[PDB]
Amino acid sequence: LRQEAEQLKNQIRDARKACADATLSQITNNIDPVGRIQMRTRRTLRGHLAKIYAMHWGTDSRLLVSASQDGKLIIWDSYTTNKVHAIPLRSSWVMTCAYAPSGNYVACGGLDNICSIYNLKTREGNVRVSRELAGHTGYLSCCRFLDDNQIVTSSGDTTCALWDIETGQQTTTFTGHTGDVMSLSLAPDTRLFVSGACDASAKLWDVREGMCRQTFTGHESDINAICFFPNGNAFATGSDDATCRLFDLRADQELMTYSHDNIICGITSVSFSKSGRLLLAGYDDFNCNVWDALKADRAGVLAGHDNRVSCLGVTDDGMAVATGSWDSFLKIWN
Amino acid sequence: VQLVESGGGLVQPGGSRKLSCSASGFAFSSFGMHWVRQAPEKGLEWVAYISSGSGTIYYADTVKGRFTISRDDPKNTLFLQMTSLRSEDTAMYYCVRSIYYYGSSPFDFWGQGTTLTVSSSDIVMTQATSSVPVTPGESVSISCRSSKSLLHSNGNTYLYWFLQRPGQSPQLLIYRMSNLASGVPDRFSGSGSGTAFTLTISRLEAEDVGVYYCMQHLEYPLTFGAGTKLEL
Amino acid sequence: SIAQARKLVEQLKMEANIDRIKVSKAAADLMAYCEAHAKEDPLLTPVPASENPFR
Amino acid sequence: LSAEERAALERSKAIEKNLKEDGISAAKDVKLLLLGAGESGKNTIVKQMKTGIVETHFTFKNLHFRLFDVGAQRSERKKWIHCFEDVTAIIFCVALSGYDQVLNRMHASLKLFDSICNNKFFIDTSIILFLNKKDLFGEKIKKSPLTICFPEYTGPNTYEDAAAYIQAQFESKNRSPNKEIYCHMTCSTDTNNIQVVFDAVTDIIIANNLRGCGLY
Amino acid sequence: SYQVITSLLLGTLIFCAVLGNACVVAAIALERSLQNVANYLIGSLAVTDLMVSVLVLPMAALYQVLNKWTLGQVTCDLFIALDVLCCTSSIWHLCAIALDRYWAITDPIDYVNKRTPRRAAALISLTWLIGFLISIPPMLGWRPDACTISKDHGYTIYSTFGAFYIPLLLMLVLYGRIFRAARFRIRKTVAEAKRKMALARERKTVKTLGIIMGTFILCWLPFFIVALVLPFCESSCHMPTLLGAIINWLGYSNSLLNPVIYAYFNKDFQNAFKKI
Ligand SMILES: CC(C)CCC[C@@H](C)[C@H]1CC[C@H]2[C@@H]3CC=C4C[C@@H](O)CC[C@]4(C)[C@H]3CC[C@]12C
Ligand SMILES: CC(C)CCC[C@@H](C)[C@H]1CC[C@H]2[C@@H]3CC=C4C[C@@H](O)CC[C@]4(C)[C@H]3CC[C@]12C
Ligand SMILES: CC1(C)CC(=O)N(CCCCN2CCN(c3ncccn3)CC2)C(=O)C1
């Protein structure tokens, strides 16, 4: 059936080439480019004493959770730089952290292969482990809450999982990646999510159906980062091959490539602005590069980190970008 | 979550007495803890505040010097050392949980209190109405006014609403003006602005019958408005 | 492996049964969303220092 | 600041105090990455020292060791090998009696050792090499020659010389002056590997301090 | 022109000393990778040499160009106090750095479990305390157009032994122990490529300790030889003006050479200057 699979791939790529009526690069020639994004670090969040691997913004656009290898999960009041909580993780080898859209839970995980859910709002004043989601046989690289009771986690066991937090059970398993799955991105309607993995492919998953709707293969190296466009009809990846690609769900094709000659290091994190015209990618060359998502031009550079920028996020109100990094510092930019 | 105050009883005027509240079932060391007293027929009056870790301590000017608040975190006990107990120190003393981070809910839990009987620029919170008679199923609004604007430059208005039910400890209803407390049914609403505030009950039950208190948490000499008792 | 091969073939068949719109229409939709929300983009169009909560 | 903002700032300061205390207590731990290939004697030396990552805590002669057994991560190491970028030493386990086995076990061990020595995140990370099952290797070397694994041996067929050649093949993968490989031969029964790890870690710390001063 | 050429030479010396020490302090303050206990001692040495270069060397350079103390007599006492304080603190900073290196090389367990910035602060405070203990007696109880340190006898032993000879002995002993430990480690690592690298590392140890102790000695030993002998040579020892000036300014040039030895030769400092 290998010949049938190869024929199906060939005819699918022929169908994709059929839809290539006009590249996104051509359409946006006659539109005004953003001049030059020059953002400035507004807050610097200090208190992580090791490498920060993940941060997530709260939906209130003021609280953010960060995960670092010092075994502490810190929730920051990014307006005042106050530390709302310092959550000591049972396993210090955290690789991902999520903040619930409600704000009542944070999740984290890593080399322990467990998604630990933390109840931020308990009757007692402590943040305690609400649930430990065991069942992944590889490290957890990403996790995102659907709501207070559902969280989707990607793993190094090449499979993503949808969890019922209350019962601690894998509601759905998202198999189909051949390499380590490195990132997740929920669509704004949370009816479907993309996941980029180490097979240099990003697969579009239906949360309810539990099956891969589409597979996107433009990258050459391991995809470390993925993020939907704000409207949910597109997403952008970030891989080790020093390029970001914008894939459209409906067009089922890569629309734009965000690469520059002097950039050779991999991309650890990608995110969009509120309008989505800016693609903010964090690179291993210690800085975050802002790209005009409609023209693939480096609008700006977020220099200011002294190590690999591992994580970055944009607030839901789009006011600020926070970039974590391996230098143990979180910086809010605006 | 429990807070069991201990002490009280008859004390001769000018004497001394130690008030202890044994916290149970919560992370007592991470909570700022208060003493709030209430004279046998008067409203609530905040006595003292010891922060989490004993870092910051405040007293009411009517007890400052005579009173000393302390906490025993390993033993989860909050103390009030009272000296020179005047006749106006005759009140039920409630120990109050309070935790302060962004979005927290201070004053959410109160202890059962102890009756202490003494033998023979503060913001003025003035909820002027009192003894409001209401009927079940009706919607009542409870007024509150502040001498100074409780609204802070940060956007937060530090007005609290409590429910002294008959024979029961106060219970937080609305912690920061228009913020509904946990476990409080969403028939209470917080409204108002600046210096004037109103607490609305959409459809009051027999559970809602009690005395409703304002409290400001803007400047630290926390003050209450004499309770607007709701009666059937 | 027959099972893995048939699962791959079925997955590719599911990939094939996708109604792919034109990429020009997709880019038009993306540009339209970017322009219809450019004003609601504090990063692209910096807000004044009064409206900035990080100042 | 408001009163509640004052108390929130005080809580944040207490949190920073606790974070500082924890980081101070954590910087005094010697972080060891236990690494190897399956049937190699990783489990034996762990049992001597005494999910997805197993962490072994043991204090030996006033020095605290955090030994990270990551053998349950059957995934791409390079996606998490950077989490151990700051380990004092990598403890690499090799089954000496793996030249005559296939899963070639010893060639796989050499390939893993090379990929770990020349990993970018481990440029200056020394390695405490353990040549495990030396009794089994001695039993198998008088019957099975060291030619199943190494065809270009062209040497004798005794236990000592064959094991020295194996250790030399492993050490030849270093290709760096700023790290050392502390090869030790273990028989899965000697209660000394803790001392060997301690001595190698002591030597690594001393050599690092000498390097800082320009004395190395 | 003798005023002008001397002024330019000493001014370039002072400017280079200020620039080098200030750049070391700025590198440690800015770069967070350069904030180590050892780096704390190195940057405290840079601070001490900066104090020397900004307080002593301008007034000393004016006193050298004009060949007389044109300032006041209370300013002369202040100059002597700052000179002795800051130079003693620089020498004892060398000793503190040597002691820290000795503890790091011979005591890895202490280096991991007990060595904290508190120890760097204790060492720095100790060096400054010894500087004060040497420089205060002239102000308290052991004391025209010339500003000279107290040429006493008891204070001469006190100020030369307490500021250089005890430091010299301590640094010699500590770096001899350090050399023994470095050699022992290199022999432990002691096929031909390994031994060639061992010989190279031994050459590196010899050259590094040579730079350290030779710069220290060449800068300061002439000064303390002259400072121990002349207060005892009532007439048997006359000091040529040019020579004695060269000795004094060798001692001062130690504060120019200290950042080079301890910072501008350190690879971490070079990388951090590159980052800046
Ligand atoms: C004013 C200046 C000259 C004072 C500085 C003295 C310096 C430059 C001189 C005096 C002693 C000399 C050192 C003496 C010993 C050795 C060890 C040898 O294996 C390498 C050269 C080396 C390291 C010399 C380097 C230069 C040196 C350090
Ligand atoms: C690079 C550095 C370390 C080299 C050594 C610098 C010192 C030792 C040298 C350089 C310039 C020299 C000075 C040049 C000018 C004079 C004026 C003369 O009437 C007395 C000697 C005196 C004051 C010299 C003292 C020693 C001196 C300061
Ligand atoms: C040369 C001159 C023309 C110009 C000049 O600068 N000076 C002063 C030199 C002082 C040099 N100090 C003396 C005091 N020190 C000290 N340190 C420690 C212990 C004891 N003593 C430091 C060095 C002259 O005498 C004439």
Side-chain angles (χ1 to χ4, degrees), chain B residues 161-230:
Chain B
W161 282 109
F162 307 98
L163 169 55
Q164 182 69 43
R165 266 179 211 120
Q168 287 184 10
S169 290
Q171 282 202 352
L172 182 76
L173 312 159
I174 285 154
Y175 61 91
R176 260 174 322 278
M177 182 278 288
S178 73
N179 269 302
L180 183 74
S182 66
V184 172
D186 52 352
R187 63 165 159 286
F188 301 88
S189 82
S191 173
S193 194
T195 66
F197 316 98
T198 176
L199 162 55
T200 316
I201 318 167
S202 194
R203 261 181 65 228
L204 62 83
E205 279 75 6
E207 293 202 342
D208 292 331
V209 176
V211 176
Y212 288 67
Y213 292 97
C214 310
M215 195 205 57
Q216 66 95 15
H217 214 303
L218 177 81
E219 315 296 316
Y220 208 80
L222 314 174
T223 51
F224 301 81
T228 62
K229 163 160 159 174
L230 265 59

Side-chain angles (χ1 to χ4, degrees), chain E residues 203 206-216 218-219 250 253-254 257 261:
Chain E
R203 251 188 304 275
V206 164
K207 177 196 169 219
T208 291
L209 291 188
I211 286 160
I212 287 156
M213 295 300 291
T215 303
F216 175 46
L218 197 152
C219 284
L250 266 178
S253 310
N254 194 215
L257 280 157
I261 303 166

Side-chain angles (χ1 to χ4, degrees), chain A residues 46-49 51 53 62 69-70 72 74 76 80-86 88 91-95 110-114 125 137-139 156-158 178-180 182 198-199 222-224 240 284 308 326, chain D residues 1 4-13 15-24 26 31-32 51-55 66 68 70 72-87 120-121:
Chain A
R46 310 168 155 104
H48 271 318
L49 292 184
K51 291 173 70 175
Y53 280 76
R62 163 153 191 171
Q69 297 285 339
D70 53 286
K72 308 294 271 153
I74 301 179
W76 305 85
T80 76
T81 66
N82 276 16
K83 297 173 185 57
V84 187
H85 299 98
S91 159
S92 48
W93 303 106
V94 62
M95 299 182 80
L111 300 188
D112 58 341
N113 306 357
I114 295 148
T137 58
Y139 60 86
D157 61 23
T158 73
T178 79
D180 292 331
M182 293 327 282
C198 289
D199 47 322
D222 292 331
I223 288 167
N224 309 319
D240 268 335
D284 305 339
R308 182 177 292 172
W326 279 5
Chain D
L1 266 67
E4 287 184 8
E5 293 179 353
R6 277 188 261 120
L9 184 75
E10 170 192 20
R11 172 210 185 71
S12 161
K13 291 322 192 196
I15 280 161
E16 322 173 11
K17 204 253 184 193
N18 273 257
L19 294 160
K20 206 209 191 172
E21 294 293 328
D22 283 9
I24 280 156
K31 282 135 71 198
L32 277 296
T51 49
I53 186 164
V54 190
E55 172 158 332
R66 295 217 296 148
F68 309 122
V70 71
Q73 283 294 330
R74 272 90 68 186
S75 298
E76 293 165 44
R77 297 182 321 272
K78 67 181 178 66
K79 281 312 167 144
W80 48 259
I81 211 64
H82 50 54
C83 301
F84 313 92
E85 180 157 354
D86 291 329
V87 289
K120 43 156 158 173
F121 302 124

Side-chain angles (χ1 to χ4, degrees), chain E residues 60 63-64 67 79 83-84 87-88 134 147 149 159 163 220 223-224 245 248-249 252:
Chain E
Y63 178 24
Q64 169 85 61
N67 288 316
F79 176 66
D83 200 11
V84 180
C87 292
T88 316
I134 304 287
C147 187
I149 192 184
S159 55
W220 273 124
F223 175 83
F224 286 86
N248 290 317
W249 283 105
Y252 290 166

Side-chain angles (χ1 to χ4, degrees), chain E residues 16-25 42 45-47 49-50 53 94 215 252-266 269 273:
Chain E
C16 291
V18 171
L19 201 74
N21 299 293
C23 284
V24 177
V25 182
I42 288 169
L45 171 70
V47 168
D49 299 323
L50 195 55
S53 305
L94 305 188
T215 303
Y252 290 166
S253 310
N254 194 215
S255 71
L256 182 62
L257 280 157
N258 273 339
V260 186
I261 303 166
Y262 293 97
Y264 298 112
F265 280 3
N266 189 359
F269 268 94
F273 291 128

